[PDB]
Amino acid sequence: HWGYGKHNGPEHWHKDFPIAKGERQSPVDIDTHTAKYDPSLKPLSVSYDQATSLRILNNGHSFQVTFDDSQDKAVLKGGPLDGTYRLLQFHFHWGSLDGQGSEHTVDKKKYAAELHLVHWNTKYGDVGKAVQQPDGLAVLGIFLKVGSAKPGLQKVVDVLDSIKTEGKSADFTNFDPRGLLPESLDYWTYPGSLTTPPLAECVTWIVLKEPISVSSEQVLKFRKLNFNGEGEPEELMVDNWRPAQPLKNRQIKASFK
């Protein structure tokens, strides 16, 4: 089964998921001098006021906070998107050191981590149908750099002790994902894929220009999680990021000048 080690990491994924070598794989490097400002792009609409978080979980690949997506409660709209996309979950990718961990890069710069808020297009009815469509998902990507603490992240960080190993989950209601956003919603956008198996090419990526800052104590808490399940040799959950993939016949558009 897949992971991020020498023998099961991103260089192996194509054997079970041959779309790993596809025409619209993610993440990619964002060359800021080649992305074109697109004035036709609208502002993004992030409507998270009615978000209903449910649980926090260690899935062996990362940790995730899940939301009730049975109604339009927390939706992403506008920007490059047609229609309404409901927030399903968010999770992160992070490094063993502050100089690596993000999946997207910006002029080859790697950030310490990257947040993915995962949304699906309601015209397809359920997430499973949406993953089979080229416009099925929209993932909002936010870079993390190490500096000042992010107060809106601290409730996440303080429960990680309780889901140390894969398969563990905990109640995590009443969490406000608005506390994870930077000030600016300036973004880059391009068509891409899931960055973990099945690597489906179903994602409109929206990557925010402005990173959020998190403290060294907060990211250290990410790094104490485990890939393994309880009672198995401890392998720290670090460097759970896929590297940049070929851009091929794609063009990255910027919402700003």
Ligand X SMILES: Cc1cc(C)cc(NC(=O)NCCS(=O)(=O)Nc2ccc(S(N)(=O)=O)cc2)c1
Q: What is the Rg, in whole angstroms, of the alpha carbon atoms belonging to the chain?
A: 17
List active site positions.
61
Binds 118, which of Zn ion, ligand X, none (CB < 5 to 8 A, cut-off by type)? Answer: ligand X
d(CA 113, CA 62): 12
Pick 64 or 84: Cβ nearer ligand X: 64
Contact with Zn ion (CB under 5 A) among 116, 150, 221, 242: 116
What's the min distance (Å) between Cβ of 239 and Zn ion? 14
Binding of ligand X at residue 116 (CB under 6 A)?
A: yes
Binding of Zn ion at residue 104 (CB under 5 A)?
A: no
d(CA 88, CA 69): 6
How many binding residues for ligand X (CB under 6 A)?
A: 14
Contact with ligand X (CB under 6 A) among 69, 135, 166, 201: 69
Binds 56, which of ligand X, Zn ion, none (CB < 5 to 8 A, cut-off by type)? Answer: none
Q: Give the binding site for ligand X (CB under 6 A).
A: 64, 66-67, 69, 88-89, 116, 118, 127, 131, 139, 194-196
Q: Give the binding site for Zn ion (CB under 5 A).
A: 116
